[PDB]
Motif scaffolding. Sequence first.
Motif, short mmCIF file in Angstrom:
data_model
loop_
_atom_site.label_atom_id
_atom_site.label_comp_id
_atom_site.label_asym_id
_atom_site.label_seq_id
_atom_site.Cartn_x
_atom_site.Cartn_y
_atom_site.Cartn_z
N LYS F 43 0.84 -1.19 0.00
CA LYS F 43 0.00 0.00 0.00
C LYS F 43 0.89 1.26 0.00
CE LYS F 43 -4.27 -2.04 1.70
NZ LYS F 43 -4.86 -2.59 2.95
N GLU F 85 -9.78 -0.06 -1.15
CA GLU F 85 -8.65 -0.46 -0.29
C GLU F 85 -7.65 -1.38 -1.01
OE1 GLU F 85 -11.89 -0.29 0.77
OE2 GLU F 85 -12.54 -2.17 1.70
N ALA F 88 -3.06 -0.77 -4.57
CA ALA F 88 -1.69 -1.09 -4.15
C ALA F 88 -0.88 -1.71 -5.29
CB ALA F 88 -1.73 -2.10 -3.01
N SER F 155 -7.68 4.93 0.20
CA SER F 155 -8.04 3.52 0.37
C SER F 155 -9.51 3.33 0.79
CB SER F 155 -7.09 2.85 1.37
OG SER F 155 -7.00 3.60 2.58
N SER F 158 -11.08 6.90 -2.80
CA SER F 158 -10.20 6.80 -3.98
C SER F 158 -10.04 8.13 -4.78
CB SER F 158 -10.59 5.64 -4.89
OG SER F 158 -10.29 4.40 -4.27
#
Lengths: 112, 112, 220, 182, 216, 166
Positions: F43, F85, F88, F155, F158
């Motif tokens: 992340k 979330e 990443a 997360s 956005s």
Amino acid sequence: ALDTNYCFRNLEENCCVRPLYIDFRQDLGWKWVHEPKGYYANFCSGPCPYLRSADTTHSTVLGLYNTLNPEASASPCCVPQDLEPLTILYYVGRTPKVEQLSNMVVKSCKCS
Amino acid sequence: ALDTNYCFRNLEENCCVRPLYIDFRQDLGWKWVHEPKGYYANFCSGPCPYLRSADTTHSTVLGLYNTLNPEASASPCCVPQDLEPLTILYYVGRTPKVEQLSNMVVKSCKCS
Amino acid sequence: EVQLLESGGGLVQPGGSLRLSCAASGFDFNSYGMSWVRQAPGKGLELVSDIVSKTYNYATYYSDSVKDRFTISRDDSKNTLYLQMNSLRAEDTAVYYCTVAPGGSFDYWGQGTLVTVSSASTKGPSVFPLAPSSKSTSGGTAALGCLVKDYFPEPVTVSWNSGALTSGVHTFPAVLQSSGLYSLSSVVTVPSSSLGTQTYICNVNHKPSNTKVDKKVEPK
Amino acid sequence: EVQLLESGGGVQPGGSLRLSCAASGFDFNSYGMSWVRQAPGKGLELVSDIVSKTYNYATYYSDSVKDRFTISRDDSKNTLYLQMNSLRAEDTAVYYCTVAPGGSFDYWGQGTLVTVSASTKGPGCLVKDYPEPVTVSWNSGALTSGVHTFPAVLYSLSSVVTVTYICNVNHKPSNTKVDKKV
Amino acid sequence: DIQLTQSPSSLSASVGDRVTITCRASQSVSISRFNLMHWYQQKPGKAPKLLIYRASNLASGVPSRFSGSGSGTDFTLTISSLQPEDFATYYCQHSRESPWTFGGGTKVEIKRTVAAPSVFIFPPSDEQLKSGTASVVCLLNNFYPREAKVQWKVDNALQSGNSQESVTEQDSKDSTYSLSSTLTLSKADYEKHKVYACEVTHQGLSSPVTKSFNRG
Amino acid sequence: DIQLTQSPSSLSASVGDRVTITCRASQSVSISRFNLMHWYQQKPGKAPKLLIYRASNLASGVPSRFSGSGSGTDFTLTISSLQPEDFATYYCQHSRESPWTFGGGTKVEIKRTVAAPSVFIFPPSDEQLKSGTASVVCLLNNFYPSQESVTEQDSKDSTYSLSSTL
């Protein structure tokens, strides 16, 4: 046969395969086995009456001997017949090693 | 090897061959056997401690697990390894029949 | 355990029939095969009939000499072995023993029943004394006896003083005379000095003719 | 739990730096340990590996740091070290301390920035002209929502919250720990 | 059918001697290591008794002097030290196949020292003469060997065809024999003569022994 | 020295979607039944986190939506139902032979909706004015999609934010 199927199905006191989970770290003190952490090793236990999965003609003769003479304490014992292997993964430092260990899992029992 | 030569000479608490005479008529109700009237069949008795004549890896693993966990009862059992046959004579009415019955006498044992 | 008692034997006309039985006790009767073994006088042993247990379907076998005329049967509840003997012939005259063979050997035997196959009629014996002389003609030994003459069939039993006098007693085997009747003597040798002091009676019994004679033998 | 807390990062070229990694909450003693590094913008690179006592503490190094870095270990303390020597420009990365019992890196520390360069200069809120990094939190870490700490561009960054308010600015290289009420 | 042949048919052996009797089957009576030949002993007026089962195993209570051997078609019985009570007929029987057959028998006589008989003559009883016949008896008591020669002499004239003989079985104790010779004449013929003699010839006698009586 | 190549180098997907990404191993990284390829999620300002070990098994606390499959040379990371979330960079790593190598990285950016920036200007404080430097800050908070500086995607929602300073 006194197999996994026969035994885990109809729950009998006499010689049958019993479930047994053995954890390498806890139950054996073997920190070196990466995969699996444990396995169903199972085991064999229960009395061997006459005509119950007799191994040899000696197992048949003792089966009948102990059935008629209960004081004898010369009865056939519940031992594995069918044994499966266990494939393990471990690391010798950073090197991955695999070892197929023979006769690790009990799949069927017999009266010997 | 847990054979008759070791077991019968030595005092063994754990797995070993134990002597046993089985008389066919008195002990089994087998009136049909004409000769012998009985035989030294032997049997196997005595606990199976860790590493003692283990039949399989499972017997080693089960022996380790047992001699490490007090609440555990799962253990290998003292059972026949080497067996000899027995020749018998019986009459089918008046017709004499001779048979070599296989694995009748236990000569050695293992922990399975 | 063991006891085997056979009965049924006796004098039978040729062509006739007889039924021998055998009472058994002291063993696992139902478990073993039973047989009849006969002995013709002064001859060998002939296994003439056989029968196995209930376990092997009471199967029988016979010798060629008695096949179709003889029948062996058993009664496991009563512990009895039987022999039906039909169309009896002279050669069927013999002592018939019932015997037990648990495996291959005839482990137990009875004492036998005599079967005599003849046209001749039952005749009782006549009993005469064989009197010793007062003179010790044998170094101081005397001999006395009983002549058991003219009887049919066999046997005769001879005892001296009800069986109390056994020493020196000789009961001779029967001799068949030209008349078809048997005859035998029973003798006993005694100290000559016993002649006037002791009494000697021979007890003769011929069961077939129901003849019992106790004959006192004394010097003449 | 597992904690892997790395320290020591912050050094003139040709210099020597000593990283420490405080490990807790696992059977450290029997697992192999590693230092994985990430260069600004670049990917992940295993730079130094060390195995347990049960395997004679055998080590291995990426070609890039061989004969310069030395990975060490203290089973009593449960601490992992990396004695970095002859430090030279391209070694400027985040150094993550990680454990692999088998073959996977099960646990990772939050890293330590090593800046190989120019002396150490001291520094919503505006963190003006200070090497990297500076950590900005609000009200000792309670004001967690709507917060936006900016990626620095001497470096200068800003941290903003949307709505008493205090920004906690920490710059360890310059021993600066200021709290500004806004 | 398997038929058995025993050799010899009869024998004499001294007390203490080793006796060997054989039995030959027409076909093998062996089935593996098991030899299905059995041996019996039959004393004169008795039933046979089992001595040896399956060629070599002694039947319960049979003395150590008795032993057996053989396999296939040829078998043996050995009395290692012959006793006077061992006087009997020995039979071999097989249990290999139906019908179980017996051998013809081997008569075992005991040879002992020579013993002369004691001779006794008995005149007919008055009670028999009342019936028209006369039986004159001669007894030869406890002798060895069995061979004895008895001659009847009515008034010094030798007799023939008017006498019968009977011999006892060998005594189980002193191993001797006894013999009866009965001379039968009609009352009239008996009353026609005076001297009735029994003349005995036997190995144990240096010269014949004559026992006689005078009618009256 | 096994070369791991991740496909694709980047990917723009929408919320809730079924994402499938691959790792290409130069040699086989399997030994018997076991496939020694592992997946990590990194992340924006965090250390990588193990998601999948031995190609198919999921690590403790890893959401049900993360699945993995593969054998020998070809491995696949599956995001069953995407989330904001799940933004990443993802990395694969093998443990077949030393040295354990990492793939390049498959960046996973999010596609949601169009949002506008709330413009915030800030005056130079008397704290900095009392020196000889004045810094005026310009802010562009929560938007989709002198020195300037942008942040990485949220997360939770956005979106982005900018920090231009004169």
